[PDB]
Amino acid sequence: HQRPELVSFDDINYNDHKKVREAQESYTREQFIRLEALKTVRKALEKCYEESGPNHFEDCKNLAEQYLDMLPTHRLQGYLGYQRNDPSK
Amino acid sequence: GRYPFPKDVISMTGGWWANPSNWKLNGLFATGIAVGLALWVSTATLPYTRRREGITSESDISKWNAAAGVWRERHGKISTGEA
Amino acid sequence: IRASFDKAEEPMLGDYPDIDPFPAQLKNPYKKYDDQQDRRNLEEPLSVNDDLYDMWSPDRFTHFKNQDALKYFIGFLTIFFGASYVATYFVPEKAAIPREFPYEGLWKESGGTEKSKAFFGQRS
Amino acid sequence: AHVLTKDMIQERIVALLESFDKVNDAKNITATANLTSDLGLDSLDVVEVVMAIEEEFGLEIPDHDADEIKTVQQAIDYVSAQPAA
Amino acid sequence: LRAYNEEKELALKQRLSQLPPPGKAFVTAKEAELAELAEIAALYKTDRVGILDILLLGNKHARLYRDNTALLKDYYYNGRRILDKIPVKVTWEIKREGAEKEDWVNQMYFLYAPSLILLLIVMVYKSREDITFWAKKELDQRVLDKHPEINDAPENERDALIVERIIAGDYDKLASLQKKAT
Amino acid sequence: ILLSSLYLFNRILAWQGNVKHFYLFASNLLLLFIVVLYINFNTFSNSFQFNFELFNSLNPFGLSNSDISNGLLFGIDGLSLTFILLTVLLIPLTLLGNWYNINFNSNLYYTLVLAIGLVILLNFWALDYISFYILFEATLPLLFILIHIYGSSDSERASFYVLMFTLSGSLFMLLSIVVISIVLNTTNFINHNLFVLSLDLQTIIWLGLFIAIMVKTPLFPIHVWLPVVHSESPLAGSMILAGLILKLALYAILRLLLPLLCEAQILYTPMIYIISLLTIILTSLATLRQIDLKVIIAYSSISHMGIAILGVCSNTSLGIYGSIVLGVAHGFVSPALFLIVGGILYDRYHIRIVNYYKGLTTYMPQLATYIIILSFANIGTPLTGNFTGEFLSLQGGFIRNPIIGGISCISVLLAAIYQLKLTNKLTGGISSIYMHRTNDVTIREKFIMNILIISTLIIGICPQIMYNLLYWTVNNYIYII
Amino acid sequence: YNAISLIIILPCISWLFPLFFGRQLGYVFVTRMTSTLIIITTLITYYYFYQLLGNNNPINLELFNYLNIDYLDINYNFEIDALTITMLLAITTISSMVHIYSIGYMETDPHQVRFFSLLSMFTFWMIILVTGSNYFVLFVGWEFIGVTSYLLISFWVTRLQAMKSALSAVLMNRFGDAFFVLGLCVIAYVFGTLNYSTIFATAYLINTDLLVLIMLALFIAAMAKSAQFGLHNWLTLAMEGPTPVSSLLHAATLVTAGIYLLLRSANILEYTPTVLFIILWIGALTTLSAGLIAICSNDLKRIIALSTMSQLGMMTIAIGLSAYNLALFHLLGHAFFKALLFMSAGSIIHSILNESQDIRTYGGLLSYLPYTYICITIASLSLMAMPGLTGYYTKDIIIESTYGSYSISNYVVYWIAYLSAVLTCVYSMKILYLTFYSNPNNNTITYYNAHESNIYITLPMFILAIFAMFAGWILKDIYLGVGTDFVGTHILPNNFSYFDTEFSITQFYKLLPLISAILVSILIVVLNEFFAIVFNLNNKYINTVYSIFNQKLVSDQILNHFIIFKGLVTSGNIAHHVDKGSLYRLGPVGINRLLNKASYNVINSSLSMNSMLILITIVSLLLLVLVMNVNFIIVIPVLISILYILFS
Numbered sequence A: 001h002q003r004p005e006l007v008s009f010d011d012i013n014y015n016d017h018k019k020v021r022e023a024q025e026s027y028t029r030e031q032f033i034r035l036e037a038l039k040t041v042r043k044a045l046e047k048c049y050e051e052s053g054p055n056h057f058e059d060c061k062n063l064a065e066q067y068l069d070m071l072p073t074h075r076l077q078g079y080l081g082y083q084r085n086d087p088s089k
Numbered sequence B: 001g002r003y004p005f006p007k008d009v010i011s012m013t014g015g016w017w018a019n020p021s022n023w024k025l026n027g028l029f030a031t032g033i034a035v036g037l038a039l040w041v042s043t044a045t046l047p048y049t050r051r052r053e054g055i056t057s058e059s060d061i062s063k064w065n066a067a068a069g070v071w072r073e074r075h076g077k078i079s080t081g082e083a
Numbered sequence C: 001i002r003a004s005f006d007k008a009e010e011p012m013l014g015d016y017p018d019i020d021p022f023p024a025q026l027k028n029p030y031k032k033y034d035d036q037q038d039r040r041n042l043e044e045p046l047s048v049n050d051d052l053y054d055m056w057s058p059d060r061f062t063h064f065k066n067q068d069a070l071k072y073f074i075g076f077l078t079i080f081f082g083a084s085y086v087a088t089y090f091v092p093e094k095a096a097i098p099r100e101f102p103y104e105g106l107w108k109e110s111g112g113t114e115k116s117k118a119f120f121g122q123r124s
Numbered sequence D: 001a002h003v004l005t006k007d008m009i010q011e012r013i014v015a016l017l018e019s020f021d022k023v024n025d026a027k028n029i030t031a032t033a034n035l036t037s038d039l040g041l042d043s044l045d046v047v048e049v050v051m052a053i054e055e056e057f058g059l060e061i062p063d064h065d066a067d068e069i070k071t072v073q074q075a076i077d078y079v080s081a082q083p084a085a
Numbered sequence E: 001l002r003a004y005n006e007e008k009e010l011a012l013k014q015r016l017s018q019l020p021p022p023g024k025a026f027v028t029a030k031e032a033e034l035a036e037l038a039e040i041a042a043l044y045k046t047d048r049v050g051i052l053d054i055l056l057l058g059n060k061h062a063r064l065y066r067d068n069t070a071l072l073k074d075y076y077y078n079g080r081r082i083l084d085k086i087p088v089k090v091t092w093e094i095k096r097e098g099a100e101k102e103d104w105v106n107q108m109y110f111l112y113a114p115s116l117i118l119l120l121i122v123m124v125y126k127s128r129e130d131i132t133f134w135a136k137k138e139l140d141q142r143v144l145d146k147h148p149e150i151n152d153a154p155e156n157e158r159d160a161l162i163v164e165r166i167i168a169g170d171y172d173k174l175a176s177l178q179k180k181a182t
Numbered sequence F: 001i002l003l004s005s006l007y008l009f010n011r012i013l014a015w016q017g018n019v020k021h022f023y024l025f026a027s028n029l030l031l032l033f034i035v036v037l038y039i040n041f042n043t044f045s046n047s048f049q050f051n052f053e054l055f056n057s058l059n060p061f062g063l064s065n066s067d068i069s070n071g072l073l074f075g076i077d078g079l080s081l082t083f084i085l086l087t088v089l090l091i092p093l094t095l096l097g098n099w100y101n102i103n104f105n106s107n108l109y110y111t112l113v114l115a116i117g118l119v120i121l122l123n124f125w126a127l128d129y130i131s132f133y134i135l136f137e138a139t140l141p142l143l144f145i146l147i148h149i150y151g152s153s154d155s156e157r158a159s160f161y162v163l164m165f166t167l168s169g170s171l172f173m174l175l176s177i178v179v180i181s182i183v184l185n186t187t188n189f190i191n192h193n194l195f196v197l198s199l200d201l202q203t204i205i206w207l208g209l210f211i212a213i214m215v216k217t218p219l220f221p222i223h224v225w226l227p228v229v230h231s232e233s234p235l236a237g238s239m240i241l242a243g244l245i246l247k248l249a250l251y252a253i254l255r256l257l258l259p260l261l262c263e264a265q266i267l268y269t270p271m272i273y274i275i276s277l278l279t280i281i282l283t284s285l286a287t288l289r290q291i292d293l294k295v296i297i298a299y300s301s302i303s304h305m306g307i308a309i310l311g312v313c314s315n316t317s318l319g320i321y322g323s324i325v326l327g328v329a330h331g332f333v334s335p336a337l338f339l340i341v342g343g344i345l346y347d348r349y350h351i352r353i354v355n356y357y358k359g360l361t362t363y364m365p366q367l368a369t370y371i372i373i374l375s376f377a378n379i380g381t382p383l384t385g386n387f388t389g390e391f392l393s394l395q396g397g398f399i400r401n402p403i404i405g406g407i408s409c410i411s412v413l414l415a416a417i418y419q420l421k422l423t424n425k426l427t428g429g430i431s432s433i434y435m436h437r438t439n440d441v442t443i444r445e446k447f448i449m450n451i452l453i454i455s456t457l458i459i460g461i462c463p464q465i466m467y468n469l470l471y472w473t474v475n476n477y478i479y480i481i
Numbered sequence G: 001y002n003a004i005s006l007i008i009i010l011p012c013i014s015w016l017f018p019l020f021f022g023r024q025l026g027y028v029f030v031t032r033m034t035s036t037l038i039i040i041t042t043l044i045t046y047y048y049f050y051q052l053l054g055n056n057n058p059i060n061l062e063l064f065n066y067l068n069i070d071y072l073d074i075n076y077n078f079e080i081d082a083l084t085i086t087m088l089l090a091i092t093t094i095s096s097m098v099h100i101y102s103i104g105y106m107e108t109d110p111h112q113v114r115f116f117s118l119l120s121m122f123t124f125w126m127i128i129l130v131t132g133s134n135y136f137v138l139f140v141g142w143e144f145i146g147v148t149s150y151l152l153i154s155f156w157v158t159r160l161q162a163m164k165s166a167l168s169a170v171l172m173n174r175f176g177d178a179f180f181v182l183g184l185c186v187i188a189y190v191f192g193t194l195n196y197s198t199i200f201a202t203a204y205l206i207n208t209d210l211l212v213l214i215m216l217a218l219f220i221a222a223m224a225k226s227a228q229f230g231l232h233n234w235l236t237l238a239m240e241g242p243t244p245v246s247s248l249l250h251a252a253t254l255v256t257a258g259i260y261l262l263l264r265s266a267n268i269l270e271y272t273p274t275v276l277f278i279i280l281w282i283g284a285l286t287t288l289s290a291g292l293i294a295i296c297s298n299d300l301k302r303i304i305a306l307s308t309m310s311q312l313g314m315m316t317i318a319i320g321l322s323a324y325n326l327a328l329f330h331l332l333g334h335a336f337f338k339a340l341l342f343m344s345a346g347s348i349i350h351s352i353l354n355e356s357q358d359i360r361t362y363g364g365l366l367s368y369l370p371y372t373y374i375c376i377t378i379a380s381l382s383l384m385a386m387p388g389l390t391g392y393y394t395k396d397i398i399i400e401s402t403y404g405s406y407s408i409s410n411y412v413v414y415w416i417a418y419l420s421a422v423l424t425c426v427y428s429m430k431i432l433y434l435t436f437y438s439n440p441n442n443n444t445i446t447y448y449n450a451h452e453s454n455i456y457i458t459l460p461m462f463i464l465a466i467f468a469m470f471a472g473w474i475l476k477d478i479y480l481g482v483g484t485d486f487v488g489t490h491i492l493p494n495n496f497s498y499f500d501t502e503f504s505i506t507q508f509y510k511l512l513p514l515i516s517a518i519l520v521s522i523l524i525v526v527l528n529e530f531f532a533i534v535f536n537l538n539n540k541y542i543n544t545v546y547s548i549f550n551q552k553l554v555s556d557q558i559l560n561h562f563i564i565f566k567g568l569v570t571s572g573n574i575a576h577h578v579d580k581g582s583l584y585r586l587g588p589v590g591i592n593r594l595l596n597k598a599s600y601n602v603i604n605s606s607l608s609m610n611s612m613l614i615l616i617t618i619v620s621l622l623l624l625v626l627v628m629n630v631n632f633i634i635v636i637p638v639l640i641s642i643l644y645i646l647f648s
């Protein structure tokens, strides 16, 4: 199981392509991890609902609210937006 | 009743009033393949079957909801309509 | 020739026969034809908009005129909807008050929270 | 299923004409009889007859062909020429 | 495999010469000439040279053989089409059930189809090193790394524990990668 | 090797006289070679892998290992690999579909066909703007010659259309490529997202690139050349053109446009959505009143490409994956329909007018089954890759703009209308009086159609099997801050 | 032994094996084998239902992944729960019965292998539809049943009208499918998934505008599928197919897919009262229109189909009341006696040498066909909700829930549905009388040769008769029980009114439908037998209204002329005037003309002329540059004019 070392666009000189590729890949992989977190949430919600039936509302309120919260933020967003813009300035 | 039909026309459905002279032996073969396929798949898909409730415990469910509350408190998360 | 869209095409033909189109469905089906199903004989001239007048064309109905059928359709819908809407006024009132539920309408059980009991919660 | 024979057609047509009232006579009905001449049927009465024939054998006669049959032989042969009769 | 024999072609050429053109060679539809057409056309499927001679020999033999085979092709297929009879067995029999191989089938069936099968197999098995599996493993390892005591819990309790911890906390590193943001 | 293989080619030509067996063998070897490459392809990396350079000054005739790179660059990532696999799948079938109906100058015909296939395959390997453009135009002379010599009655006008429209778009593409070259002094695809041009310059370059995309995809209102060029092309030309050359456009968007002109693309996206909704609705409607078989099949492709475009500019991972899957599924299905109309019916009856055809089920039940299957596949039945592509593309489009995507959902209906209206007349009714009975579909035709059907079904039941090559790509091009 | 696996796979075998091997087996074995497989499937479904009533713990079958991109995770997941098992009861019972029936009904036809394979295919894809655990599998089944409907309605391929009807059906259901795809897109965007569990877990928190959008799209899909008055014309064209096809389609499955889609979406439906209102009122309109057309039609199959439409609208009303158990129970009960109606109709048609379907040509067959008479009579009486029959326990309580509804406005719906019921008794009695009770209208030879059908036709009618008498009573507790938890739909307590509709009902409203049904039946029979003039009048105005009602309420006219034909005309306008008009003007043709003219002009005394040219160039250049020095904008028109001279 590979765990490549994380790199950020902010530190690097964009003229070393190896580092830039590593930054792009690291950003993508973190997005995918965030997706896995969202899916874990959703699977827990499904199990909660299926076992709680009529009182699933009270039993699963926390999971439902959290899943609805992480939906707009835990998708893919791609690295071009952040490498091509520096948020400081 | 019936009428003449071109004999050269070959269709995998058999065409007109297809009733082959060895149909009983081909039928034995067909039913053998049928039972084989049905039984094989019924056994093969057995591990992927489960009941709806009783799979997880109340412990897991309650602790997961509590963890979700913990997450929603670490962030600033009000409830629906809570305003 | 008869329809507006066929008339529109008359400048766009040069040396092609200006045929009067007749719905092939309305050609009586007891005459003999080279292709009985399409009710066409061989080398019969084709109207420029033929594809709208062959047998494969959408069926045409002769009983009512198109405008008249439109009048009937809209009339049925209007009378039905209007009669129902006006009937809503002349309505008896019920006899039993709507049912209610404990715990301020079970607002806990349909999720809900103390800060929001109006969104989730029954008649109590 | 059910299949008709020329003689069956002829027998049904003969009975049909026998029961018609405006006929001159019943005995005079021949296989080659002319409804217009021998049986003395009106312009419209032969029309009534052809309607009866189509209603009996369960077919539909076009206008151009109905008026063409003038003798009972013509009628029998025409009814035998149609497969769904 | 070597099977060429220039003696035979220099003979086959005039054996062809006697016959009318293959376009008009069967338009009669006597049986003797049709018989000789049967045998000469049968010569088409009797393969008459292998690889050792096409590689080694000169081009005059090449052109002569090419013309011979062209005329044999024509006789075979023109008869087979305007007679409904195969030129094997040697006078024109009707036995069309089987013994028919087109030239494309060997290459396609024995190379292209195995290639597509191989492609499907490779895709199915390359689908295993998917990023979803990698990320599930990575999330599990991050939980185990931060919190190694669930390594003491028994197998069935483990996975529920990892799920608990995942739900509660943001084990990702994305914000850590976004250092200029704060 | 090359010397020996050339000797082999020459000897086979001298003895056999028809190159076509050699070309079939060659193309099958190329397919096997690409599969070997896929085996050895690392999928846990977003980097181009099988790199090589040509026409470098230190080694004009070989590969370059120099520290200065002034030649043409080639290499592949997952996105290029997908389309390359599609190409090598399609080429041998393109050779095979004309195995018997070409009886004159046949060697030249097969040479042109194989050359066009190789040109497209190489085009997918290109890694910089100049080589991409070179191989992007190199087909036009071959297509012109092929259509002019081996085409149907109206083939001269067809050849002139296929050359002129594509040149017209390509020269504006050339303006954009020249501007990029002189502004950046670089042309590569490896690091071209690292250069952030001023917004105005991006807006200007985007115009030339997108004009090329409009002509090549095609999109409304400059699509009128495609139905011609298709109807008068020979079967190989039509199959190649429908199955690969159109996907070159989609690959062009993803490779040349999105990584470089991100902000300008964000600015222009609603214009793209206008043009795609136009092409879908209007071409689908115009298909209803066509009377030629090949013309109708040609009109279908434009609408499916419109849905593909709506997917590919959606700025969502789902939209891009849907566009790719739809491209691949279209490359499977459309060649099959073109095979039917222009190789089976056309080679048996030598006519394409719809009125002549009717009730083909009675004599040719197998051909009728094939028509039904292919048509329900073309209109997007689930468990076919076409449905997955259209569904994901529509999801992306609806997310990017809910109104426009919601209206675009009418494509399902419109596609059903024209396709099923065609197949209704073709399959049923009483057998036509104008035509006589001919053979049913043969072993070769059935083989080709079975290949295409099983491919589209396989990716339709489990579209995930493509993900291992494309999971980097679905993130490499979306622009979210 | 796995119930769910066998249920999904035996019908698949019964579908594919005929297609793979029909030339090798022949229609004898193919018919027997497909029938047997469907019987085994039905028995397994019954056993499963028995156990589920014992223990409501549904089985799930989770298989390989369809899609795992971004947030969307779609899997081939199947489950069988109370709703699904109800649907599967209907489906498997009627499919098995129709397979048996088709052995007899279809014994003469050349193409029986393809027919039976298609019936089995349709059964399989419907089972897939109702068993899938997420909206995607639902869609797969949803569209494949449309494909099979196309292939069945055009089974007699050589008949032009058959293929036109098949095209109509497939295109209207593709309209429904376009709206369904819109709904799928919005569901995936809003919820991030298609699974039932997640959507139902987080439905109650979602913004109501989004829910209304989703539910309007899905309801349009179900409206097309369930032949509501917006999209209904295909329903009555579908009787172009063989009678067993109409039996399967109009009773158990094809028209019930829409009702199932709404029933599955119930949890979403509750939080969107607006669409519930729209559903209720569209259902009322459909039931009224279907009954009105039913009175004035003369074809047997068309009558039965319009009855199907009316009942579909009535369950649509039941949905609109949030009485979901009510509509489900009517769906299940209606499937049985509707299939029986169609089968008995097939027998009646087969008894006639002409094989006519017109009701005005049947005459009196009560002596000739007593067993078919008793079967059709049982079916009708179940349909009119006669006391102690299965249709009673469905139809009467649905009628009463409208009065019992909390919404004040639903009292109009009460009278509308009531009119529809007595309307229904009217055409049921008309068909019964005109087939068995009237004086003979067909010629003598038919009455000589009129005889019953074979055992393969008779047995399924017998079985469906015992069902249409006993099933409603034996099952009323399961679906309409005071406290029943079998179907686990979570009804908003505010909306739930099933107690109110029973306690609040008065003797007048609870008795009026039954009394009116019995009276109007007797009235129609006695008026037909004693005062035929009142029916066979000759008034011009009444003939006009009758003509309106006979032509599907002149809606089919409206569609074919104003939508379909106008769209074909507009397509012609585009394809010619735009595509081969304007686009070619700004294309090959216009450019060709422009270049011809310009080239002709530039080509249009080898010395003197050229010398004049050189002077003119020199002087023109001098003057032009003088102008440019003055002001460059002024020279642009001069250059334009110069080019106009030279090229034009």
Ligand SMILES: CCCCCCCCCCCCCCCCCC(=O)OC[C@H](COP(=O)(O)OCCN)OC(=O)CCCCCCCCCCCCCCCCC
Pocket (backbone or CB within 6 Å): F050, F051, F052, F054, F063, F115, F118, F119, F121, F122, F125, F134, F135, F138
């Ligand atoms: C006329 C149009 C304009 C023409 C412009 C360009 C014309 C180019 C002419 C075709 C030549 C390109 C194909 C051969 C080049 C690749 C040869 C090679 O050796 O590949 C290099 C690459 C790296 O190899 P290496 O670094 O040496 O390490 C080996 C480790 N064992 O090893 C690899 O990774 C393998 C690379 C596989 C490449 C696949 C190429 C697909 C098609 C091959 C033939 C195409 C011929 C095209 C003919 C029509 C013209 C376009």
Ligand SMILES: CCCCCCCCCCCC(=O)OC[C@H](COP(=O)(O)OCC[N+](C)(C)C)OC(=O)CCCCCCCCCCC
Pocket (backbone or CB within 6 Å): B041, B044, B045, B048, F454, F457, F458, F461, F462, G012, G062, G063, G064, G065
């Ligand atoms: C005729 C219908 C029979 C369907 C069921 C019978 C199969 C018996 C085994 C059951 C498991 C299963 O179906 O999946 C089959 C396999 C195993 O996947 P899995 O990991 O075990 O499932 C996951 C279950 N979880 C979620 C519990 C872990 O998946 C695959 O290779 C996916 C590739 C798709 C097939 C390749 C296309 C070739 C088809 C050619 C098209 C014409």
